Amino acid sequence: SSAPRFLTRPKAFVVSVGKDATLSCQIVGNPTPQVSWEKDQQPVAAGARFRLAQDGDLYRLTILDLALGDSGQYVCRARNAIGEAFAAVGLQV
Amino acid sequence: GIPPKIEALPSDISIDEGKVLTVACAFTGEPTPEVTWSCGGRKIHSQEQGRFHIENTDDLTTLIIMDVQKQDGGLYTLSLGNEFGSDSATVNIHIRS
Ligand SMILES: [Cl-]
């Protein structure tokens, strides 16, 4: 039915170092897209450092206890049966 | 006046044959810079009847490659330019079976 597309490009929300940080975006598609994240071409492994979640068309990566080591180019990949959509965001803590 | 800057463009991206590819990249610069997508020294032209499409706003560029074919694989260069300077960045698009 529809290839994935970003309604909102990935945007970072930072409070401070030591507090959680969120890279979030709005993605549409039919079938609904699968979202994957990669920091500096290295894929994000969910767990202690990162947490992935999605409320409807809102997809969000949470970086727990933000550190200077979390700085880098994060690439969001929305994939489905029809296509792929890529968009990136540079995080500088 | 403000010189242009490519915000964040992926280094490498991969897609399977026959699918649609979308690469959205944000940019800065006043006056609004000339967006130029190129591959192997050849400028990508947004052909309405073709497979390749480029959707440009005042702050965002989007590369569209419909029904991706093996030949489309390569090193794509996004290049902005205005009265006050220029910036370039590369995305290595890979094609798979
Ligand atoms: Cl990829």
Curated annotation (Swiss-Prot), chain A:
Subcellular location field: Cytoplasm, Myofibril, Sarcomere, M line; Cytoplasm, Myofibril, Sarcomere, Z line; Cell membrane, Sarcolemma; Nucleus
Disulfide bonds, paired cysteine numbers: C25-C76
Superkingdom: Eukaryota
Post-translational modification: Autophosphorylated by protein kinase domains 1 and 2.
Ig-like domain location: 4-92
Signal peptide: none
Subunit description: Interacts (via protein kinase domain 2) with CDH2 and (via protein kinase domain 1) with ATP1B1. Isoform 3 interacts with TTN/titin and calmodulin. Isoform 3 interacts with ANK1 isoform Mu17/ank1.5.
Family label: Belongs to the protein kinase superfamily. CAMK Ser/Thr protein kinase family.
Clinical disorder: Rhabdomyolysis 1: An autosomal recessive disorder characterized by severe and recurrent rhabdomyolysis, usually with onset in the teenage years. Some of the episodes may be triggered by exercise or heat; others occur spontaneously. Rhabdomyolysis is the rapid breakdown of damaged or injured skeletal myofibres and may require intensive care management. Muscle breakdown results in release of myofibrillar content into the extracellular space and circulation, resulting in hyperCKemia (hyperCK) and myoglobinuria. A chromosomal aberration involving OBSCN has been found in Wilms tumor. Translocation t(1;7)(q42;p15) with PTHB1.
Functional note: Structural component of striated muscles which plays a role in myofibrillogenesis. Probably involved in the assembly of myosin into sarcomeric A bands in striated muscle. Has serine/threonine protein kinase activity and phosphorylates N-cadherin CDH2 and sodium/potassium-transporting ATPase subunit ATP1B1.
Official protein name in the record: Obscurin
Species this protein is from: Homo sapiens (Human)
Primary gene name: OBSCN
Residues of the full protein shown: 9 to 98 of 7968
UniProtKB/Swiss-Prot annotation, chain B:
Domain Ig-like: 4-92
Post-translational modification: Autophosphorylated.
Localization: Cytoplasm; Nucleus
Expression sites (tissue/organ): Isoforms 3, 7 and 8 are expressed in cardiac muscle. Isoform 4 is expressed in vertebrate skeletal muscle. Isoform 6 is expressed in skeletal muscle (at protein level).
Record note on quaternary structure: Interacts with MYOM1, MYOM2, tropomyosin and myosin. Interacts with actin, primarily via the PEVK domains and with MYPN. Interacts with FHL2, NEB, CRYAB, LMNA/lamin-A and LMNB/lamin-B. Interacts with TCAP/telethonin and/or ANK1 isoform Mu17/ank1.5, via the first two N-terminal immunoglobulin domains. Interacts with TRIM63 and TRIM55, through several domains including immunoglobulin domains 141 and 142. Interacts with ANKRD1, ANKRD2 and ANKRD23, via the region between immunoglobulin domains 77 and 78 and interacts with CAPN3, via immunoglobulin domain 79.
Domain comment (free text): ZIS1 and ZIS5 regions contain multiple SPXR consensus sites for ERK- and CDK-like protein kinases as well as multiple SP motifs. ZIS1 could adopt a closed conformation which would block the TCAP-binding site.
Note: In some isoforms, after the PEVK repeat region there is a long PEVK duplicated region. On account of this region, it has been very difficult to sequence the whole protein. The length of this region (ranging from 183 to 2174 residues), may be a key elastic element of titin.
Family assignment from sequence similarity: Belongs to the protein kinase superfamily. CAMK Ser/Thr protein kinase family.
Protein task: Key component in the assembly and functioning of vertebrate striated muscles. By providing connections at the level of individual microfilaments, it contributes to the fine balance of forces between the two halves of the sarcomere. The size and extensibility of the cross-links are the main determinants of sarcomere extensibility properties of muscle. In non-muscle cells, seems to play a role in chromosome condensation and chromosome segregation during mitosis. Might link the lamina network to chromatin or nuclear actin, or both during interphase.
Name this polypeptide is given: Titin
Gene: TTN
